[model samples]
Target: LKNNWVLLSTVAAVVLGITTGVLVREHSNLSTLEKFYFAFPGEILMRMLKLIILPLIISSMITGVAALDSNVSGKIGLRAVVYYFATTLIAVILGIVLVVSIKPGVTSTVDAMLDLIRNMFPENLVQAAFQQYKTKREEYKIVGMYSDGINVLGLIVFALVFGLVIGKMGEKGQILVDFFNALSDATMKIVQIIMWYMPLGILFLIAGCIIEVEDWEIFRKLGLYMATVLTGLAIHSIVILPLIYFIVVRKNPFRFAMGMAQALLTALMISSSSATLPVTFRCAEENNQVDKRITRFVLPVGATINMDGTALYEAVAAVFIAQLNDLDLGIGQIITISITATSASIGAAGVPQAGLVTMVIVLSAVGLPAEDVTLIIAVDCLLDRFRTMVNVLGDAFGTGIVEKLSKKEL
Candidate 1:
């Protein structure tokens, strides 16, 4: 009946689809019509969403830069950006500390698991053997220090530099701004076109996830590890974030939580920071009482760098991996993890699966097996939803804190 019905209906579809999938398993083949109904919609939605994103980002950046001509917008934007980075760094550090104390990955007789992890990465002899085994074309080489997962960092640098250059171009900038503005409008139109099929995409996504979820035993097996991650995330989202919100905004924490719940839930379902950005931005403005200028600028930047959950995950995961191998991380190793985790969080984006890429960086930094990352990949997606929700919540809270701080400066 109302706009809220879309989110409500989507959630219902996910729940219903999961239930139906479980019941229908191995009973009979799905009908062609039923298969088409399920398959085509998701494919179309993916295509449409993908089509809109590149243009949307380019246009949004151009417009944002053009609008930044004003000193007021510029100052507020700077303050919000600083606050966002600071809070995210703190949240990530806290996650690392908590997870290390919990030691979720420890179990008896893990030598086989540790060996599996060690050989996960492609090495010179192994690469040559693989080439001999499979007749490969190119040989693999060890990755460079800065070239590892620094791709995300490069993307941010490019975007910011491009935006600033466009903003400073004066009349030429106006012409480019107008073009990007039009481009953004067209992208929004495409988003509307794509959203029409969201229900279907959501259905397939949920169905696939549910169908493959072999047993709750997986959780039980990894319960300590999962609990370690969940506990860290909860601390960041519920405790640290609220404390920051109350101290800075001096507002009703419960109301803020309620306002952000939809975005948080959407983030959980999608397991994507970028995917949840639209709803998160809307919630910040309509629900959380964030000013539009701050929301527009801050949310996007936060999405790019404010990965509190993932950062914490990296810290704990690195330690867990070392502990599993019976390798003792001296004080130096732990500190290295803290520094890498913080930097990686700042470098990672809000996009789904971006954390996986960053994990490679953290592992490589500490001379851990990069391929061992796959061990956690089993539960990573499921966990990512929870983490991403925290990521957005942290971003929103940080924005409020920054806004209040900005007002004080005025």
Candidate 2:
């Protein structure tokens, strides 16, 4: 009920953060030491939250899937998976639709595909915990290697299996299932504590982000380009998503979105769908009253693989570059962007900078020059927040829809 207070504080934090950054930037140019210090408080918040993520994700999945009757769990999982990708496709398609009508500016198709399949059964589960499989080959040949980042794909498969095995054990599974439930609950309790500290962290985070951005004129220069991307995102977020939710669940989509308000804004500030998971779960479950089983089991998967906004942004940017080069894309070129967008998203589900690297695949798939990526770099940070917000919102809605669809099973 007192989301009123939390929402007020969060809103206040963003405004103050922006004002602080504008004022400091106007008065004094910061040095290297000052920049490091400015980021200190911000880093602390992320570090603290990231530490909670390992257990938060693992325990939530194990207990949730374990709690469900294993026989019918397959249907729920399938529904969840289907819904996530459905919207991803829609986002890309809508993006292409708008970009074709407006004309804006603007790959590694194989490596990412290999990376995606390889992630499912990682060579070493322990290694997968700390590193994800990746591939890079500038030549005709492809080479695969490991990079530092959580392979949540591997973890999810393992956790889901572990949950199934535990459920299969019947009576013997109770104690272990209880332990997993307790573990996830404790992790959430810690997240509740972290949420209280977040606004202060957000203040420093947004301030540091703003101050580090040396110029505000980039947005003005990229105005048309920016407008196209934002409009695509807004359509996806405000129109397409809610409309789909209403059709599927017969619930007021905006009402559901209001419950996710704090979490979505967190995604906006931090600009990461993955990092925003803890808050998304808390909101969807506590505020929106999504079933814990669906929230825990499906929502984590959504965060990992469900990135509609990222795909939409990729589609718009890829074609927009075509406009910049005065090259009109064929229907074939636009179609491949959709497929490549889907693949890269699936392939690099949990890795870092795969989004940017995914752009390489998008342009390459359509035979576009990679050099034009520079056009995107200037406004990348700003648009990142909006897209991430859409992504988290999509995930939240997916959880609720899945909950509604599989109500009797729950």
Whole-model Cα lDDT per candidate? 0.65, 0.81
lDDT for position 63 in model 1? 65
lDDT for model 2: 0.81
Looking at candidate 2, the ten consecutive residues that score lowest on lDDT are 345-354
- When summed lDDT is taken over every stretch of 10 residues in candidate 1, the lowest stretch is 128-137
Error of 2 at 240 (Å): 1.8
> Which predicted model would earn the best TM-score?
2
Native-to-model Cα distance after best TM-score fit, residue 113 in candidate 1, in Å:
28
Alpha-carbon shift of residue 79 in model 1 (angstroms): 2.4
Residue-wise lDDT of candidate 2 within 1-410, one digit each (tens)?
37387788999999999999889988989897898798798889888877877788789999888888968788999988888778888888998899888864530566656776788899998898878888788667878788988788889889999999999998998899899889988888898888899999999999988887757788677777778878888888888888888888776888878867899888788777777888888788888877888888888788778888788878888888767777777877778888988776665553224478778888788787778778878777666767777877888878878878877776
| Model 2, TM vs. native | 0.94
Off by over 4 Å in 1: 1-3, 25-43, 70-74, 108-159, 162-172, 407-410
User: What residue runs in model 2 are displaced by over 4 Å at the alpha carbon?
Assistant: 1-3, 106-108, 137-142, 349-354
